[PDB]
Curated annotation (Swiss-Prot), chain A:
Residues 1-37 are annotated as: Disordered. InterPro entries: Rbsml_uL15_N (IPR027386), Ribosomal_uL15 (IPR030878), Ribosomal_uL15/eL18 (IPR021131), Ribosomal_uL15/eL18_sf (IPR036227), Ribosomal_uL15_CS (IPR001196). The modification N6-acetyllysine is found at K46, K54, K109. Pfam families: Ribosomal_L27A. Component of the large ribosomal subunit. The ribosome is a large ribonucleoprotein complex responsible for the synthesis of proteins in the cell. It is found in: Cytoplasm. This is Large ribosomal subunit protein uL15. Keywords: Acetylation, Cytoplasm, Hydroxylation, Phosphoprotein, Ribonucleoprotein, Ribosomal protein. The modification Phosphoserine is found at S67. Belongs to the universal ribosomal protein uL15 family. SUPFAM superfamilies: Ribosomal proteins L15p and L18e (SSF52080). Residues 1-29 have a biased composition (Basic residues). Hydroxylated on His-38 by MINA.
Swiss-Prot record, chain B:
HAMAP family: Ribosomal_eL13. GO terms for cellular component: cytoplasm; cytosol; cytosolic large ribosomal subunit; cytosolic ribosome; endoplasmic reticulum; membrane; nucleolus; nucleus. The modification N6-acetyllysine is found at K15, K176. Transmembrane segments: none annotated. It is linked to Spondyloepimetaphyseal dysplasia, Isidor-Toutain type: An autosomal dominant bone disease characterized by early postnatal growth deficiency, severe short stature, genu varum, platyspondyly and severe epiphyseal and metaphyseal changes in the lower limbs. This is Large ribosomal subunit protein eL13. InterPro entries: Ribosomal_eL13 (IPR001380), Ribosomal_eL13_CS (IPR018256).
Length: 147, 210
RNA sequence: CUAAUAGGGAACGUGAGCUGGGUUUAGACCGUCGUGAGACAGGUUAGUUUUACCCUACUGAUGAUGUGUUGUUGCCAUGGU
RNA sequence: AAUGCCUCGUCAUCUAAUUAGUGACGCGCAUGAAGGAUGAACGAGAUUCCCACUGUCCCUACCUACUAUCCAGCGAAACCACAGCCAAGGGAACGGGCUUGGCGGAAUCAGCGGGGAAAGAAGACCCUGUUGAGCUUGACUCUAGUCUGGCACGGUGAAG
RNA sequence: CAGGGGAAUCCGACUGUUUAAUUAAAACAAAGCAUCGCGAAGGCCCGCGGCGGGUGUUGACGCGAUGUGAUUUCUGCCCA
RNA sequence: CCCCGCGGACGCUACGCCGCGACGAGUAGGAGGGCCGCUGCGGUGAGCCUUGAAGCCUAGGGCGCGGGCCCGGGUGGAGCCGCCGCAGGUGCAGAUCUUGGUGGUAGUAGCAAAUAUUCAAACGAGAACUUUGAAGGCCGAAGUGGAGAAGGGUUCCAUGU
RNA sequence: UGGGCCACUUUUGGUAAGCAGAACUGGCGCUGCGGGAUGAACCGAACGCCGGGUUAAGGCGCCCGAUGCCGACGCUCAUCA
RNA sequence: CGACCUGGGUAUAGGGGCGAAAGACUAAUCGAACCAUCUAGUAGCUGGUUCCCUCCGAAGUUUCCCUCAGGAUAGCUGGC
RNA sequence: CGGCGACGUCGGCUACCCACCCGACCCGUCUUGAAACACGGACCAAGGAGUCUAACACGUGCGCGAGUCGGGGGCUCGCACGAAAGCCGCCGUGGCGCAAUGAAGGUGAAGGCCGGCGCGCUCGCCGGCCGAGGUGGGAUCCCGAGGCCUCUCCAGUCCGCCGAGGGCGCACCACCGGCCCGUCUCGCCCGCCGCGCCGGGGAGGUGGAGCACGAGCGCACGUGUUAGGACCCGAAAGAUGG
RNA sequence: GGGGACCGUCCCCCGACCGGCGACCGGCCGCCGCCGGGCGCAUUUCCACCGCGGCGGUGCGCCGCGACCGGCUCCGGGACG
RNA sequence: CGCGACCUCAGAUCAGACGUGGCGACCCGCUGAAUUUAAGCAUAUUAGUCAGCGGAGGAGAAGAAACUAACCAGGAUUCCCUCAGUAACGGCGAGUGAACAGGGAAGAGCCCAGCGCCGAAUCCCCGCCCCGCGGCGGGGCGCGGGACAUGUGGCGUACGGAAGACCCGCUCCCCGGCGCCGCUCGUGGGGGGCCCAAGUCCUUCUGAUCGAGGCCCAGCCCGUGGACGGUGUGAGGCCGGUAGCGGCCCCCGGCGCGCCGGGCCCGGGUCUUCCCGGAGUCGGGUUGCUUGGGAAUGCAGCCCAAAGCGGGUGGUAAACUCCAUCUAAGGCUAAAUACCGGCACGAGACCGAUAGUCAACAAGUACCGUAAGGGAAAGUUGAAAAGAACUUUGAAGAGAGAGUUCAAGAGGGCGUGAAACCGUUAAGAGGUAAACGGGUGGGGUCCGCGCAGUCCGCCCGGAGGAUUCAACCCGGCGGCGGGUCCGGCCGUGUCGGCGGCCCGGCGGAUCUUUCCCGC
């Protein structure tokens, strides 16, 4: 809505808010990111450190699919199965532990942030972090790898 | 000019963009026009499925999608051979065939041939001359059961095997998943250089005594 | 020559007053400088000087206000000198 | 000297008087040899003097034609914040307006060139612009054309 | 109808030409003088290109490129 | 334990109403409010209107700090407005602004290059300028004469206005 | 916004400057009002629309509000006060 | 009477022509014609920038910049 | 409490003309400074200049919320409106968020207390519990001795208010610890189908746009910056083709 | 591949207790109120007129005057320490 | 030294055909800047863009891998979403910048050369006859010509192919008509023509009315039609239309059946024996350009110049090695996609005569320039011309009367008719240019139903009317309360689950035939 903007309030005011002395001129200071190493150096250094220069090795023909490895933490691990699955295992008399296939849920690597409920579980993943494996074995579970 | 904190922006509007702008005011009209063509095509092939030929079961290529199965271009010639369908007859009865697809594994080959055999059973074939049926189908079921199928023929369906909760064995509990992955990466990384060093030691052993 | 040939101001008074000799465009010559284009409070020669009918100022010319109209003869405030 | 700053150089001549002219001199700021130095004829070329001539002047006057002027008819434009009497003051340091004073009398005509820092043109001088253009050059970077080497078209025989 | 004249200095020899619309000149041109390139598979020049084109329907007493500027008289030294 | 009285103002769009205290300059600039204003759209006003819409004019009556608004009178002759939302090509004194129109200047400058006109008559409402006659002059054959090229294109010729 | 300027005092260059350059506070710029005749900066005082009272700085012959007090004490005559 | 004047027909076209040379002329345009387009070219520079009331209210300083008529930056401001 | 009221008067500070006193220079603009002898403006009418797209940032409103979002497609008599609206859920592919760190190979965020033991060697095997530590502040909330009452007292029956002290402490802030990735220094252990130039672990500093019981996503609006003709008008120029 | 079992949400019912009839409604009662029709037909009630009537409110068509009270202010007398 | 065959050339107004030029919005092939940004500027950017040249079609181009990948693999082209402002390029500055995978729209595949076999099996032209005409085809005939072994046709093309045997299946194609369907289709398939509801009812407004009231029976009439336009207003019913799987008529096209004219001629599986490919091309060097392509993405020039268990690709140059993947240097192909030009339509929160196209109108017109080219201004009487008869002054323009009209205070550039500016009338004023702010005063035009100046509540008094005032009776309707008095309830639990995978659903990453269909 143009009726809600400053232009409707700047009618009758000669400089339209831009000022009498400095005026409103086309491009004082340059166009775009002009003078980032010259007359705009302080802004670029103050707010965008690292902007200028090369770092690291380039890699031609990067294929993002090859590096595809979504991760899930242990605190969210039991959300990949139904609530029926986890209550049944807890009240199960035997040592039967449910299987959580994180690849089926869309994750490849299991990370170890958080803590697990005290009940065994079999976790199937492409990759495991060291601490995720340790926490799964602490609750009596097992980690088995898939390809 | 930069003003305080902000994101260094690089708009790509230096190239006279206003002369090549694609508006979408014909999008509602385009959706109507394609839908008329879809309906007209379905009427033209009256009993044949509206979507078209049956397509094969296909696993997606890369490591991002290789857990997912989709529909492919056409059944392979190897798939048709063990299904007993001529590669020139199949296209006349609604089987799409891709001459340039090979079957690297038997499971993919064997899954697609059950798709073909099962589709062959579901197929109702009208005789070329309705008065004289040679080997088409019985008129009892080709009359009443003949209906234009809507949607893809036998839609490709991602099936998940449900794993039964079981007791964890001690062997499973003793497996070191993280150590195995770290050792496997090292073994694959140093396989070539280990063979060279073993070879260079072998050349030292064949001449250790002189 | 004369009594004397005093010094100055007025947008270094005064160019819709003039003139255009000088400076200070474009042509050209000389000297010096510069590789050169070219330069020179150096010299020289040739080089368009536009408009007032407006307001005021001033100069003159009719008139205007008050004594009823109109005329003759007069006075002198003031200004110039 | 169309070339000399000093310089109105010095001497002579021309005049009553000459920063002018001519003649002469020359340590010539900074003359000079394809251009130097002369020399008739010629020149809408620059300069000095003389005779004659004259309103150039003393020193202005008179006359003629066409205007201007007045009238009948016809009939623009430039320009215009508002306007239009001065002295001083202060003020963007030169006012028509403001302050203090002088004062101020309708509507006009022919003139006039003091003012309106009059009009005409977004100063051409000067400076600035990370604005040009014409031209020049061992400025930077190139380039047509040219000179040279190589490969191909590109062959057949001999002396080496 | 229809030249004022004379004595000189400077520049340009002369006649000619020139900035239409501020400069007619001492400027340009000029004849004369000097130098340079070239014998044609060439000199100079045009051309995006063709063994294209101009000089050239030409051939050194000719074409092309410069400087100086009639006549007279001279034109000195320096190739770092 | 109201009752001879059966009764007792207003209020409180709560985005409303009421009380008390202090305070009030403003360029550049920022913000808020606008029942300020323009045009169009969705709703709404059982809205207005040929028994007179819009627009315009007005020594008419008023309202608001103001932007503005309402009403009377006239003209006009077919449409228009309020409120809740929505959306803008939405508000002018300037830009040597654009287009159009109009002033002062001003009945002014001016209608002054090439010697020159005059008398009578005719037609005609009307004659300095037309026509005829008379007279005085000019071009003076390198013409203000007689014919062509280029260019123009009907300007040629009659009659009429 | 990133042209500042002015005044008391301190202060550098300069003969000096309504010059140029600093320090400190205030001001003008952005600010009207009373007074200084007049005036960006001085003195008083800062401002919604008004009535009454009183002041500031400055004034009270007349212009022009207020001494039209029987004001006090002296000084001073200028033919540029 | 001549490097004379002139009509018509031809040829040379824009970084090109033509020039007895003045940067002259090339359709009132020439130290690079005219027409259309790229093009609403860019401008740290000049000019303008349209209703009301209420509240708050500056800076011409720091640092860096081919920076000195401009920006970035801190400061001063407003709003939430 | 008084006077006066219809063809002459009564009231109307507004509005029309005139008079007088006081005050009062022409606006706009640049500027330290304009009434300026600084520029633009003779007059009137109509037109006339911060817009739209995209991308960010922050603030605000709305829905859902560790999710969120169908915008591309498809299904619905194919169409007055309707080019709308509705629906999809094996259309959520995908985007953004839910994990960071390193150039990279890669790695990748849980601690506290109670016990027996090696030697509770700054320490390794377990048990049990609780589930992101602690200090100082911290709105709010909780307990609360003692008070405040009645026509009066020996004696409690029900709750209300004030209340010194004490307690649990939100968000947030300061600080101290802890955890993840990079990199240094020191050092000792552990694992095996590959006994390796293999793999893992510790302590102490330090680099990170991290963790430490999520806050995001979509839509709308406003402001600011930027690329676009970019608030409007304005060159001297350059290029292409005639 | 089906078909089953189980679990989670549901469903309409067969039934009781629980809080209430609620802003989800009806029937009965009780109280109250209103309306219509009778009765009541006049010391009641209601309607309109008159008084230059009284009490209240608002306000006087215009132009004026006075009085006391209170707030602010400028002055003047008298007396006491 | 002649005549023949062939080869390579030439002429013809030879017989019969074809191309040229235009448009050019979209598309294909080239060529190709500079302004601009970088706060200067040269690489870069602008941009493979403007301008320039060529060539097409209703689309074009592309296109069935010398591909993508590195996976558990996908599988022609084109378009959309995303990948992604990412990998990468870049005075690594300003800036630039894809692809694969994934999800969709659409979906379609094929043909030669070569290698071989088949008595050239092949093709064009010319005469004759028949069936036809409707773009000129079919059949038969010709000791009729020509092309062609310097290679036509059939089979066949990497997905392998061919030929022989053995076995099995006889299985059935495409073309033009005769008559008729289903009537072609979301209810016609398309094109054209002509038609189809209901007030001009009563009273009134007006110049005119389409306006305003009314139209008993639940209401004037129709409504599958209340879109729109016209008509003297403003109309669902006055008219044209509008709605309708409404009617009639005319013309044209592909769809099934029986027949006709002719073609029409073996397909699959196993085994055996054979056969298998595109060269001044690839590739390499170099140069220039181009790209995100970076020790060089693509394109081109020049030089070099291949191979056949070969060649290409595998995003860092090179050697060795394994592996993966495709098979270049020949060709065709619909759909999804594009469309500021054209034909014909529909619509709009757009503009409303200085706006919107330059152009609402005799507009690319008038006009300007030698030319290239530049390029306006300009809408409105009235319902109807009913466009002012006639009289009178004047030479006429122009007037005064008269007349039409609702209105000419609408009179042919005529709706309305502002401001600037001007004329006249009226009022007021006038020597400090006007104009302005504050304060009064005077005059004037108007306003105030101004002109004897409020209203109304109660009570008192006077003089009159009317019922009926209260209280009781009957009926109706409301408000409030009631152990639920009685229901119907509702919220929360509470049990048998009688109740559902037959006699109720939807889900679950929960368990199973140990009763049932594929290894
Ligand atoms: K602003
Ligand atoms: K005197
Ligand atoms: K000589
Ligand atoms: K001469
Ligand atoms: K130039
Ligand atoms: K001569
Ligand atoms: K001459
Ligand atoms: K030659
Ligand atoms: K020479
Ligand atoms: K030499
Ligand atoms: K030499
Ligand atoms: K409305
Ligand atoms: K108002
Ligand atoms: K009106
Ligand atoms: K700032
Ligand atoms: K700044
Ligand atoms: K001639
Ligand atoms: K040029
Ligand atoms: K400076
Ligand atoms: K001015
Ligand atoms: K969608
Ligand atoms: K998601
Ligand atoms: K990573
Ligand atoms: K912008
Ligand atoms: K042209
Ligand atoms: K990037
Ligand atoms: K043959
Ligand atoms: K009809
Ligand atoms: K190459
Ligand atoms: K290979
Ligand atoms: K136009
Ligand atoms: K046109
Ligand atoms: K009219
Ligand atoms: Mg302001
Ligand atoms: Mg303005
Ligand atoms: Mg401005
Ligand atoms: Mg002077
Ligand atoms: Mg002069
Ligand atoms: Mg003068
Ligand atoms: Mg002179
Ligand atoms: Mg000169
Ligand atoms: Mg020299
Ligand atoms: Mg001299
Ligand atoms: Mg001269
Ligand atoms: Mg005159
Ligand atoms: Mg006297
Ligand atoms: Mg001498
Ligand atoms: Mg003399
Ligand atoms: Mg010599
Ligand atoms: Mg004066
Ligand atoms: Mg003046
Ligand atoms: Mg200037
Ligand atoms: Mg200029
Ligand atoms: Mg600068
Ligand atoms: Mg330049
Ligand atoms: Mg050099
Ligand atoms: Mg001469
Ligand atoms: Mg000579
Ligand atoms: Mg001449
Ligand atoms: Mg001249
Ligand atoms: Mg001359
Ligand atoms: Mg000589
Ligand atoms: Mg010569
Ligand atoms: Mg204020
Ligand atoms: Mg606008
Ligand atoms: Mg205006
Ligand atoms: Mg005159
Ligand atoms: Mg005259
Ligand atoms: Mg004569
Ligand atoms: Mg003649
Ligand atoms: Mg004639
Ligand atoms: Mg500045
Ligand atoms: Mg400064
Ligand atoms: Mg100073
Ligand atoms: Mg200064
Ligand atoms: Mg300022
Ligand atoms: Mg201030
Ligand atoms: Mg002040
Ligand atoms: Mg004052
Ligand atoms: Mg003074
Ligand atoms: Mg006062
Ligand atoms: Mg005084
Ligand atoms: Mg006085
Ligand atoms: Mg612009
Ligand atoms: Mg421009
Ligand atoms: Mg620098
Ligand atoms: Mg400036
Ligand atoms: Mg200015
Ligand atoms: Mg100044
Ligand atoms: Mg000013
Ligand atoms: Mg001044
Ligand atoms: Mg200026
Ligand atoms: Mg103007
Ligand atoms: Mg002017
Ligand atoms: Mg306007
Ligand atoms: Mg939709
Ligand atoms: Mg996903
Ligand atoms: Mg805490
Ligand atoms: Mg810490
Ligand atoms: Mg920001
Ligand atoms: Mg340039
Ligand atoms: Mg630049
Ligand atoms: Mg710039
Ligand atoms: Mg530049
Ligand atoms: Mg183009
Ligand atoms: Mg063509
Ligand atoms: Mg094609
Ligand atoms: Mg193709
Ligand atoms: Mg192929
Ligand atoms: Mg992304
Ligand atoms: Mg590019
Ligand atoms: Mg599809
Ligand atoms: Mg063959
Ligand atoms: Mg009809
Ligand atoms: Mg109508
Ligand atoms: Mg109608
Ligand atoms: Mg119909
Ligand atoms: Mg590599
Ligand atoms: Mg127009
Ligand atoms: Mg109009
Ligand atoms: Mg006339
Ligand atoms: Mg009328
Ligand atoms: Mg009219
Ligand atoms: Mg008048």
């Amino acid at each position: 809505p143009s009726r809600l903007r400053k232009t409707r309030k700047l009618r009758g005011h000669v400089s339209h808010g831009h000022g009498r002395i400095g005026k409103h001129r086309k491009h004082p200071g340059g166009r775009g990111n002009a003078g980032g190493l010259h007359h705009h150096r302080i802004n670029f250094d103050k707010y965008h450190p690292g902007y200028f220069g090369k770092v690291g090795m380039k890699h031609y023909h990067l294929k993002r699919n090859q590096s595809f490895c979504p991760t899930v933490n242990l605190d969210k691990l039991w959300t990949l199965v139904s609530e029926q699955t986890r209550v049944n295992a807890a009240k199960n008399k035997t040592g039967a532990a449910p299987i959580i296939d994180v690849v089926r849920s869309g994750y490849y690597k299991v990370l170890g942030k958080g803590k697990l409920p005290k009940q065994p579980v079999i976790v199937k993943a492409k990759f495991f972090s060291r601490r995720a494996e340790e926490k799964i074995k602490s609750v009596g579970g097992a980690c088995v790898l898939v390809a | 000019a930069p003003s305080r904190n902000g994101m260094v922006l690089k708009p790509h509007f230096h190239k006279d963009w206003q002369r090549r702008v694609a508006t979408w005011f014909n999008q509602p009209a385009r959706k109507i026009r394609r839908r008329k063509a879809r309906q007209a095509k379905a009427r033209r092939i009256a009993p044949r499925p509206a979507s078209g030929p049956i397509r094969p079961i296909v696993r997606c290529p890369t490591v991002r999608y290789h857990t997912k199965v989709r529909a492919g271009r056409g059944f392979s010639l190897e798939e048709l051979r063990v299904a007993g369908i001529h590669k020139k007859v199949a296209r006349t009865i609604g089987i799409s065939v891709d001459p340039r697809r090979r079957n690297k594994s038997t499971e993919s080959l064997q899954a697609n041939v059950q798709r073909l055999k099962e589709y062959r059973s579901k197929l109702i074939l009208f005789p070329r001359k309705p008065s004289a049926p040679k080997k088409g189908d019985s008129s009892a079921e080709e009359l009443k059961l003949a209906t234009q199928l809507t949607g893809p023929v036998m839609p490709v369906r991602n099936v998940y095997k449900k794993e039964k909760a079981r007791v964890i064995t001690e062997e499973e509990k003793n497996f070191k998943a993280f150590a195995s992955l770290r050792m496997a990466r090292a073994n694959a990384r140093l396989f070539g250089i280990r063979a060279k060093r073993a070879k260079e030691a072998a050349e030292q052993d064949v001449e250790k005594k002189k």
